[PDB]
Design an enzyme around this catalytic site. Structure first.
Site, short mmCIF file in Angstrom:
data_model
loop_
_atom_site.label_atom_id
_atom_site.label_comp_id
_atom_site.label_asym_id
_atom_site.label_seq_id
_atom_site.Cartn_x
_atom_site.Cartn_y
_atom_site.Cartn_z
CB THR A 156 -0.91 0.02 1.23
OG1 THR A 156 -1.46 -1.28 1.37
CG2 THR A 156 -2.01 1.06 1.16
CD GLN A 157 4.74 1.11 -1.73
OE1 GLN A 157 5.53 1.87 -1.17
NE2 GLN A 157 4.63 -0.17 -1.41
CG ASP A 201 -3.38 -2.15 3.71
OD1 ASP A 201 -3.39 -2.86 2.69
OD2 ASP A 201 -2.80 -1.06 3.79
CG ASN A 256 3.65 -3.96 -0.53
OD1 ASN A 256 3.09 -2.91 -0.84
ND2 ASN A 256 3.15 -5.15 -0.80
#
Ligand SMILES: CC(C)C[C@@H](C=O)NC(=O)[C@H](CC(C)C)NC(=O)[C@H](CC(C)C)NC(=O)OCc1ccccc1
Ligand SMILES: CC(C)C[C@@H](C=O)NC(=O)[C@H](CC(C)C)NC(=O)[C@H](CC(C)C)NC(=O)OCc1ccccc1
Ligand SMILES: CC(C)C[C@@H](C=O)NC(=O)[C@H](CC(C)C)NC(=O)[C@H](CC(C)C)NC(=O)OCc1ccccc1
Ligand SMILES: CC(C)C[C@@H](C=O)NC(=O)[C@H](CC(C)C)NC(=O)[C@H](CC(C)C)NC(=O)OCc1ccccc1
Lengths: 204, 203, 221, 213, 216, 201, 197, 202, 196
Positions: free
Chosen positions: E1-2, E59, E104
């Site tokens: 999840t950049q 997430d 990441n």
């Protein structure tokens, strides 16, 4: 940082009726020492002195420009400048260049012309004035000096004790900074006399 | 920020939310975005708070001198034109979008929207700010010509309520002002008063 | 820096911490962030310290000239208009966040002025790094028309929340109480934290430091 | 986009003596201008005769300490002996260097008694280089803490001063005093000081309170 | 999840004698937009522990799926052992740090509250892997606003009753609603006690807007 | 960092300063910048402290395995090449290491300079580090192959001291080692402060 | 890249300069003189960016000459150094900043010999011996080792030759010929150029 | 692109615009954003056309194999769960936001919105795409619990029509599909059929 | 920076190289040899990036020496140049690229004297004369003006001295000494270094 280019360390301490100011003597372009006799402490009013650390050009320019204003003020007023007034004058000079500042942080040590009360003050590059009852430190080794001064300083120190305390803090602090050192000069300002002493310091 | 103005026969109703935010922090939860440029002319302010307040103060001063010199009540179009001229001249400098609504003896209730870029349009209903996008469909479907002053006050409150719920920037209390020949009446709607629309209920 | 203000029933209470920080080092432990704009108007200062001192001093001088010309006590709106107009022209380059509180003929008024020149008039305002912490105390325990002592206690609690929960704020609490009949500048109003006693005294003795050269020049008195 | 590191603050000091080793740290964990907790000690007891002090990014510190503890168990199983303070220092240098390309953001000072029983202080740079020093300070206030230790334990820049072997009482007084001075001038240093003393009998932990401002 | 997408705001935890309480708003926002307002950001890992997360909801959903699977597997074993709140916390710190090292990160900040062995546990895990335990914890804007209020009460009274902790959480949730742009009125309070984990929702906070008339 | 080595009639002289600096902070004044790979071989460390320490220690491990495997000591030329090959594999990856491998082997006295860039050269006189320029001049002016051991020791001490005076990142003490056919011998460790009094006096 | 050196003794100032002018990889001139005579007893040696060196030095030289014509007496070396520092520092923050490293050498009858070092940033330091350019890093160490304050003029040339010899041995750049001059009570005196070939 | 799905008792109503645009050029003015994953499960697609087509093709293959092996009608939740896994796993590599609306015997008509990033949420009504921002207020105000299929068809058509007028990216014919146990019925509203809201004047 | 030159006469190839190895501002060595003896009649002169020159040149030398041990006969100068070009070209698009500029001089009994010029980009050209380095720009013209296909070995040494003399007068860099070698049917013969 621009301040680290030429290096420099200045600090002032307050005693019972005396003030002391000390400075490193090394002038270096960066990692190279051009001279060991550079002046960072400039006499302003006989018992009033200003120590400037930062770019060597700015230190010289502000001392030269401040003296021009002080000399004119003393002639028109007819009186020696009070230590607080010098802080206000230097702050005005630094703020005038707020958008493009002189890279110098001034420390002022002086005795009041009539009362002879001890005064110590420090200013930022843009002219903020801070006045303290103990010690003021400016320079590349400022964090090191703050650590030494906080532990060593004690209230109502006699002139001899003040000299020993300022010297021990300056010597050990310049020892931990690569771009400051090559000797330290200490001036003790007392109403009766000025004592100027050059300490033995490591040359490296 | 959601700002809305609706014209009614003989008058205009102006509405706005009350939230000023720096990032995700609300600096002011009760801000007044409706500013009185003149006795019967008001502006709803959106965009930078500093830019809008400065432009509004300058127009109020200029319109005040203009009214005293001409010895006549000022025109809404004149107030909008002054805002458009400042906004267009310094469009790059100012992030400000303003809706000017007021009553003139000559043209009654008029709503003029000056968006960023300094363009001026007279519209029957004008909405502006971050929350405006969420309420565009509601305003188009609900708006009906011939809406009365009370109907316009209900229309503006219902729209602002929907925008405040779906927009992070919009929020707080709904401030409403109605301008007509009689004068300006201002009301604040908060808590139960703010219109409530049922949320979806599927856990 | 935590600077905060509230409007009580008869006046304004303005509070600030005394910590000035250069980088992560604490440069000053006794900084007066409450400045005098006029006898009835005081401004709390946050942001670049040199900018705040100069902005308040210029506005205070302008009000003093205005007050002498008018022959009347200065109004808070004049300070807000002067401060907001000056900050706007600098376009946020002068970083002064200011809480301006004063009592005039019209009544007790409190304003918050931002560096870009935005101004908000509010019952209670908080500015600085600890502003969010102070706002939480003000939201949790603020009632309109509070008495002077209750106002002093609440503003001190808000300043203390900034000192304890913010690294930038710290050292001491200073409160200025402004009312039509009385102005009290209390510095330090409370000293929340103090340095510990030095367990071992170094007491450097005479002769400890070696001196290469000594010059004594007598000064006549 | 995403930055892998944050500075959580904190200062660690270790002083070595003939019969004792003192490792001390502040208890403040901070992110940006806020305090996460006032009760996180940065001193960890690796063995009966060894303590490690870690300051820097907290995530690296927790990972490094868990790896060091695991490695100590693996060595004990294979060599049937506990790892010496010097051996721990050499292993740590290798582990830190293993991540040279993506460095562990931690300053580590290892303080413990040696095989002879003398105090040993080993100081590590983030990449892994280590040196044995009589006294060392690490972390945000390392610059403030070290000059005083050099002047007092070192007796540097002092003339006509008797050099007296450091005593636990003087060393404790110095550790407490340097930390109170650091609390005054460091935003990331404060709340409390945990002093762990390594002696032949065992490791003893004492807590002193610094300013909460 | 950049890059985070739909995200949750502050999660508040306070420890009381006999348990822990965690509170979270029920909204997930895509930037300014309040896209989903009925989402639940509190999860019950097991009877002993509960988890609340602030940050990318996607997430959090992956982590809930992984954590839920792990608890189901241990329950099948019937060993009589269980994951203690500290063990779940240590697993999360290892998972977050491992993802950060691979560049990441799971873009989430989580509070773990559990009551086990007659001791209350509250823990914080960041995306970077920074982790610690405290009596009161807050994530996002909560650290700036709610944590100062929680810490002050905790210093005056170190041990809090369940009713006092519930009141403190409601007062702090009101402050976030007033000063956090991404906050939502609807919120859930979860309590872990000797009996177990109970989630209460959707609670709402009464708010006072009297200051609106005060400004002149 | 100033480290100097020269080959003269009586052997190879290796000299070094003792200052390790993080930024402008002087972290250490007691660092040992010469590593003893074997009783007859020495390695000089300049550049990043960890990079030089790990790689020179790795060379020392390889040299002991060579001695154990072949029952003969590694040559100065072989050790220098081995360090050059290992550092070259990581070329362009940010390792900063400047080293002089000085030893006595079957061929005779040997001096080699190995760099992180990958330069490997053999010469009578070499100086490496920030203060190398200052050391090079004093060493070059007073250097002769026929210099006696006492004269050689003084040249090495003077060259490090003058370099420390001019360079901010150089200082501490002058560590002196003399490589001889029998083996390396540590000679003297002198503080620049003590040296300053002697030279200035 | 260009080299300037000054050695000051009890009654004299010995100054030397590289004689090479270069553009790109080619030395266009081998006879260049970087020494500008401000007054009968003052020399200013300038090394720096192209154009800036000539423009700044010529302006300072002409202004110093004007002082002699207007007042009838020449400036002291200290006054001339302070005048150059003020002009360069004033131009530093100006739109056109001169990138010039200057060494000022002069003999004043009242205060004796003087050598002044000024960086491009405009910091003026009085030094017993000074050097400019990359050559200084190699040369200064030799001067520190062999310089005594009571050095004779013949010994000063011996020291200067040693410094220049090191430059031939270690400097990557080719600087074959150096111009040497001395200032004393009699005035500026040209000395034979030191050419290593 | 505006995609809307609403759940009525006994089934789901799906709707979408017909415009695919590259820059300000409408490459396809009649595109079908509504696609069949299975007999009674459909997905509304928004975001990159290539990504939406690829994920839809893969999930249809995955769902079909699962249904044949289980010998049972597929659950709407499973189609959404398969879509969620693909979007979360490749969130960096994909720009697709999808709505899964379908009828299953066990839970009835259901709408699941998988927004970009791979989150999965069940919503009574879901709106997606650039046009969605304009209708957010209308959908909240207009929605009434207990709406019939006919009301749901009108609600979806009115909302899509409002979004198409405001959004340049949205536009073209309105495609509406109704899914129930009986089957899937698809209607296209074009020209006068599309709902019309009066433009403001003066 | 580093200077290489070659002159191919009727029965010989004459090669010269600067003998200075330098750090950023200081010359570390003045006795450096930039010529590698690949075979009895083949010399490789390599200049370029630090590290890359020593590693690549040594690798080519070991492979040419291996060919002699395996087959008992030496590679032709043309074959040796082509083997070097292929290896450098393969590395060009590899993660590890060698920045090496090379001159190959060799004598083949069948084909006589050969001089080859190869840049860092691995383009191979046979040349009567070629040079590498910044000094090559100054010296290529002198070689062009006085070179004759039938030039004598003594005259070639004189022509080389004229190019070296030009470098001293006009080149900014200091290159005091040069290594001179001649390849002939008899073999590589070292010649007295030209010094200034
Ligand atoms: C009537 C309205 C125009 C007032 C209100 C409503 O839109 N203003 C706003 O919502 C806008 C948001 C916009 C810039 C995205 N906020 C603002 O204009 C400013 C935010 C600053 C960063 C410039 N509001 C504010 O309180 O500024 C405080 C400040 C000012 C300078 C530096 C730091 C903080
Ligand atoms: C309330 C003020 C008196 C100062 C207060 C700010 O709120 N605290 C501070 O720490 C200030 C403000 C800074 C964080 C922007 N920080 C500072 O670093 C100092 C304060 C010392 C001079 C005493 N202010 C200052 O201007 O010096 C640093 C500097 C130098 C050049 C430009 C901007 C800032
Ligand atoms: C052991 C020797 C090889 C060291 C020697 C060599 O130059 N002297 C030195 O001065 C070297 C050179 C360096 C400034 C590039 N100094 C160093 O290597 C020092 C090591 C100290 C921190 C313990 N600097 C360093 O390694 O950086 C590590 C680091 C990283 C982040 C923060 C603080 C320190
Ligand atoms: C079937 C729908 C899901 C398609 C609809 C959705 O909004 N429109 C789209 O997906 C895009 C615009 C979108 C990226 C904002 N519109 C389009 O017209 C095209 C598809 C044609 C080339 C066949 N998409 C597009 O951007 O070009 C291909 C592309 C895809 C990714 C990156 C760069 C370029």
């Amino acid at each position: 940082s621009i301040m680290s280019y030429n290096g420099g360390a200045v600090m002032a301490m307050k005693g019972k009726n005396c003030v002391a100011i000390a400075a490193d003597r090394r002038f270096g372009i960066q990692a190279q020492m051009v001279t060991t006799d550079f002046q960072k402490i400039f006499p302003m009013g006989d018992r009033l002195y200003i120590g400037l650390a930062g770019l060597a050009t700015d230190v010289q320019t502000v001392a030269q420009r401040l003296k021009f204003r002080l000399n004119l003020y003393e002639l028109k007023e007819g009186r020696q400048i009070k230590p607080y007034t010098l802080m206000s004058m230097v702050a005005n000079l630094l703020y005038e260049k707020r958008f493009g500042p002189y890279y110098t942080e001034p420390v002022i040590a002086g005795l009041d012309p009539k009362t002879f009360k001890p005064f110590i003050c420090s200013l930022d590059l843009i002219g903020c004035p801070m006045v303290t009852d103990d010690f003021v430190v400016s320079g590349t080794c400022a964090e090191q000096m703050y650590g030494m001064c906080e532990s060593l300083w004690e209230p109502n120190m006699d002139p001899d004790h003040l000299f020993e305390t300022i010297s021990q803090a300056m010597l050990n602090a310049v020892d931990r900074d690569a771009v400051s050192g090559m000797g330290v000069i200490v001036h003790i300002i007392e109403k009766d006399k000025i004592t100027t002493r050059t300490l033995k310091a490591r040359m490296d | 920020t959601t700002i809305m103005a609706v014209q009614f026969d003989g008058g205009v109703v102006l509405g706005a939310d009350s939230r000023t935010t720096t990032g995700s922090y609300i600096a002011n939860r009760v801000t007044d975005k409706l500013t009185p440029i003149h006795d019967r002319i008001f502006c709803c302010r959106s965009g930078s708070a500093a830019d809008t307040q400065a432009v509004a103060d300058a127009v109020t001063y200029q319109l005040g001198f203009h009214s005293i010199e001409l010895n006549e009540p000022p025109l809404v179009h004149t107030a909008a034109s002054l805002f458009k001229e400042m906004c267009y001249r310094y469009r790059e400098d100012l992030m400000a979008g303003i809706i000017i609504a007021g009553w003139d003896p000559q043209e009654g209730g008029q709503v003029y929207s000056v968006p960023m870029g300094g363009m001026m349009v007279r519209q029957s209903f004008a909405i502006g700010g971050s929350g405006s996008s969420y309420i565009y469909g509601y305003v188009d479907a609900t708006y009906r010509e011939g809406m009365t002053k009370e109907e316009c006050l209900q229309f503006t409150a219902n729209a602002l309520a929907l925008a405040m719920e779906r927009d992070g920037s919009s929020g707080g209390v709904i401030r409403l002002a109605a301008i007509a020949e009689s004068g300006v009446e201002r009301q604040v709607l908060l808590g139960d008063q703010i219109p409530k629309f049922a949320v979806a209920t599927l856990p | 820096t935590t600077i905060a203000g509230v409007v009580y029933k008869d006046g304004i209470v303005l509070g600030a911490d005394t910590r000035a920080t250069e980088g992560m080092v604490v440069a000053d432990k006794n900084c007066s962030k409450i400045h005098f704009i006029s006898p009835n108007i005081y401004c709390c200062g946050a942001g670049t310290a040199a900018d705040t001192d100069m902005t308040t001093q210029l506005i205070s001088s302008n009000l003093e000239l205005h007050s002498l010309s008018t022959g009347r006590l200065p109004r808070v709106v004049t300070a807000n208009r002067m401060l907001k107009q000056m900050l706007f022209r600098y376009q946020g380059y002068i970083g002064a966040a200011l809480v301006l509180g004063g009592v005039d003929v019209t009544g007790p008024h409190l304003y918050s002025i931002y560096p870009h020149g935005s101004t908000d008039k509010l019952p209670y305002v908080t500015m600085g790094s600890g502003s969010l912490a102070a706002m939480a105390v003000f939201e949790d325990k603020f009632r309109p028309d509070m008495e002077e002592e209750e106002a002093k206690n609440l503003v001190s609690e808000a300043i203390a929340a900034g000192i304890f929960n913010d690294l930038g704020s710290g050292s001491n609490i200073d409160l200025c109480v402004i009312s039509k009949n009385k102005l009290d500048f209390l510095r330090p109003y409370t000293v929340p934290n103090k340095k510990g006693t030095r367990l071992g005294r170094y007491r450097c003795e005479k002769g400890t430091t070696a001196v290469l050269t000594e010059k004594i020049t007598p000064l006549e008195i | 986009r995403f930055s892998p590191y944050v500075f959580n603050g904190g200062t660690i000091l270790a002083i070595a003596g003939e019969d004792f080793a003192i490792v001390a740290s502040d208890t403040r964990l901070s992110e940006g201008f806020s305090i996460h907790t006032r009760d996180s000690p940065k001193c960890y007891k690796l063995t009966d005769k060894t303590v490690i002090g870690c300051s820097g990014f907290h995530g690296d510190c927790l990972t490094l300490t868990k790896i060091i503890e695991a490695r100590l168990k693996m060595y004990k199983h294979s060599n049937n002996k506990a790892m010496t303070t010097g051996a721990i220092a050499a292993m740590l240098s290798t582990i830190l260097y293993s991540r040279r390309f993506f460095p562990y953001y931690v300053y580590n000072i290892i303080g413990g008694l040696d095989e002879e029983g003398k105090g040993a202080v080993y100081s590590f740079d983030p990449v892994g280089s280590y040196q044995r020093d009589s006294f060392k300070a690490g972390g945000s206030a390392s610059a403030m803490l070290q000059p005083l230790l050099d002047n007092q334990v070192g007796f540097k820049n002092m003339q006509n001063v008797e050099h007296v072997p450091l005593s636990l009482d003087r060393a404790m007084r110095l550790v407490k005093d340097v930390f109170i001075s650091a609390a005054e001038r460091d935003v990331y240093t404060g709340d409390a000081l945990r002093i762990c003393i390594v002696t032949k009998e065992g490791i003893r932990e004492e807590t002193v309170s610094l300013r909460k401002d | 999840t950049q890059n985070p997408m739909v995200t949750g705001t502050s999660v508040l935890g306070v420890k009381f004698e006999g348990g822990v309480v965690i509170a979270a708003d029920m909204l997930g926002s895509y930037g300014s937009l309040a896209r989903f307002r009925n989402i639940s950001r509190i999860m019950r890992v097991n009877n002993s522990t509960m988890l609340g997360a602030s940050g990318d909801y996607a997430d959090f959903q992956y982590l809930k799926q992984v954590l839920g699977q792990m608890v189901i597997d241990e329950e099948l074993l019937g060993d009589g052992h269980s994951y203690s709140p500290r063990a779940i916390h240590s697993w999360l710190t290892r998972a977050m740090y491992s993802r950060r090292s691979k560049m990441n990160p799971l873009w989430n900040t989580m509070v773990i509250g559990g009551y086990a062995d007659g001791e209350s546990f509250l823990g914080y895990v960041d995306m970077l892997g920074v982790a610690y335990e405290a009596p009161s914890l807050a994530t996002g804007y909560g650290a700036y606003l709610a944590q100062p209020l929680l810490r002050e009460v905790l210093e005056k009274q170190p041990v809090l009753s369940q009713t006092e902790a519930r009141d403190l959480v409601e007062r702090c949730m009101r402050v976030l609603y007033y000063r956090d742009a991404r906050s939502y009125n609807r919120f859930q309070i979860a309590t872990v006690t000797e009996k177990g984990v109970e989630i209460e929702g959707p609670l709402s906070t009464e708010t006072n807007w009297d200051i609106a008339h005060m400004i002149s | 960092t100033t480290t100097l080595a020269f080959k003269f009639r009586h052997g190879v002289i290796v000299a070094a300063d003792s200052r390790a600096t993080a930024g402008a902070y002087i972290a250490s004044q007691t660092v040992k910048k010469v590593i003893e790979i074997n009783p007859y071989l020495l390695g000089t460390m300049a550049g990043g402290a960890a990079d030089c320490s790990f790689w020179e220690r790795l060379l020392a491990r390889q040299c002991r395995i060579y001695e154990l495997r072949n029952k003969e000591r590694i040559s100065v030329a072989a050790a220098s090449k081995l360090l050059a090959n290992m550092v070259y594999q990581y070329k362009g990856m940010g390792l900063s290491m400047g080293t002089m491998i000085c030893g006595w082997d079957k061929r005779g006295p040997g001096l080699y300079y190995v760099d992180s860039e990958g330069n490997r050269i053999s010469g009578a006189t070499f100086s490496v580090g920030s203060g190398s320029v200052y050391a090079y001049g004093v060493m070059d002016r007073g250097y002769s192959y026929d210099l006696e051991v006492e004269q050689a020791y003084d040249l090495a001490r003077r060259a490090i001291y003058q370099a420390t005076y001019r360079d901010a990142y150089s200082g501490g003490a002058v560590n002196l080692y003399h490589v001889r056919e029998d083996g390396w011998i540590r000679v003297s460790s002198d503080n620049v402060a003590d040296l300053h009094e002697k030279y200035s006096g | 890249m260009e080299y300037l050196i000054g050695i000051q003794g009890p009654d004299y100032v010995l100054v030397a300069s590289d004689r090479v002018a270069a553009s790109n990889i080619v030395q266009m001139k081998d006879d260049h003189d970087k020494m500008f005579k401000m007054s009968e007893k003052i020399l200013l040696l300038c090394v720096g960016e192209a154009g800036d060196t000539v423009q700044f030095a010529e302006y300072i030289q002409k202004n110093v000459q004007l002082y002699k014509m207007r007042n009838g007496y020449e400036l002291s070396p200290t006054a001339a150094a302070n005048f150059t520092r003020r002009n360069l520092a004033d131009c530093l923050r100006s739109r056109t900043p001169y990138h010039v490293n200057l060494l000022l050498a002069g003999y004043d009858e009242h205060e004796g010999p003087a050598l002044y070092y000024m960086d491009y940033l405009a910091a003026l330091a009085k030094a017993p011996f000074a050097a400019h350019g990359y050559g200084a890093f190699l040369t200064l160490s030799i001067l520190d080792r062999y310089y005594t304050p009571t050095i004779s003029r013949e010994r000063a040339v011996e020291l200067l030759r040693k410094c220049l010899e090191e430059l031939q041995k270690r400097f990557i750049l080719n600087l074959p010929t150096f111009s040497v001059r001395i200032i004393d009570k009699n005035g500026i005196h040209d000395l034979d150029n030191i050419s290593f070939p």
